[PDB]
Amino acid sequence: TSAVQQKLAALEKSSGGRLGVAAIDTADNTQVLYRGDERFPMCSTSKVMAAAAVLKQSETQKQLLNQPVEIKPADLVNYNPIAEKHVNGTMTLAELSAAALQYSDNTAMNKLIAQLGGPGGVTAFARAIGDETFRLDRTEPTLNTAIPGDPRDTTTPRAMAQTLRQLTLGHALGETQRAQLVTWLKGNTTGAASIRAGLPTSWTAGDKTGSGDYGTTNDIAVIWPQGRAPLVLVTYFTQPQQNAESRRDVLASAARIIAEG
Ligand SMILES: [K+]
Ligand SMILES: [K+]
Ligand SMILES: [K+]
Numbered sequence: 001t002s003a004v005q006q007k008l009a010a011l012e013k014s015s016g017g018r019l020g021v022a023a024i025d026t027a028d029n030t031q032v033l034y035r036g037d038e039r040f041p042m043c044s045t046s047k048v049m050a051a052a053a054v055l056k057q058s059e060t061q062k063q064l065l066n067q068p069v070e071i072k073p074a075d076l077v078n079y080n081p082i083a084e085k086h087v088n089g090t091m092t093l094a095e096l097s098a099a100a101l102q103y104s105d106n107t108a109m110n111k112l113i114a115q116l117g118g119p120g121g122v123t124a125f126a127r128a129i130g131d132e133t134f135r136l137d138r139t140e141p142t143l144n145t146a147i148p149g150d151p152r153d154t155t156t157p158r159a160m161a162q163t164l165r166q167l168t169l170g171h172a173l174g175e176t177q178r179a180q181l182v183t184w185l186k187g188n189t190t191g192a193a194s195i196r197a198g199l200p201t202s203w204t205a206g207d208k209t210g211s212g213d214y215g216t217t218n219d220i221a222v223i224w225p226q227g228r229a230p231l232v233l234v235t236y237f238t239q240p241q242q243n244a245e246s247r248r249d250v251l252a253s254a255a256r257i258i259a260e261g
Pocket of ligand 1: 102103188189
């Protein structure tokens with residue numbers, strides 16, 4: 001066990017839950033893993049794969065992001081901070097991608113899934129970029145059940161870290177699309193208490209959070225330190241009690257341990 005792994009194991013022990021971490025240092029492609037091959041519920045971190053899949057489509061469909069999409073009453077689910085502002089109006093796929101990514105809007109996610117022809121369309125994009133691990137099975141809000149041992153709507157930290165790297169730094173997308181995704185992640189509003197809270201303040205980051213039942217608390221990020229090659233960090237966390245509170249502090253502390261090690 002490495003010194004970082006010992007600190008992560010100690011953090012996990014202190015927490016009562018199950019922690020998964022994958023970090024990639026793009027300098028020497030060094031990676032640090034903790035439970036890196038275990039499945040975790042993705043919850044809203046799956047919105048990155050759905051938005052990226054739509055971005056991939058827009059590479060050949062040049063007008064796709066400006067395409068208006070109707071928001072109807074029946075579309076509303078459990079958490080719709082942006083979509084509920086536009087009921088009986090429209091939102092563009094760009095606006096829906098932004099809402100999904102920067103506000104974790106679940107109605108917006110469902111519109112991306114529908115654009116892609118169902119959850120199978122999101123999973124197919126994962127496979128098309130070499131991710132054999134990601135699986136999206138359900139729409140919002142049922143994808144957040146986060147039931148212990150259920151493989152539905154899960155991935156591993158190792159897989160999501162590699163995917164996130166390919167999407168935001170490594171040309172799985174076109175350049176206009178990659179920059180748009182980087183811009184979206186940087187502008188996230190839901191991440192201040194998660195990975196970002198554990199990083200040196202001179203570092204810049206983009207991220208996508210997730211949360212669900214079993215106190216599931218997740219964050220995935222791409223990170224730019226100054227005069228150092230960028231990093232990719234995934235932190236997944238879930239707990240034994242179905243009704244457990246969120247533990248964003250665990251993700252912040254994991255990021256601190258990675259940043260230092
Ligand atoms: K978010
Ligand atoms: K959400
Ligand atoms: K909460």
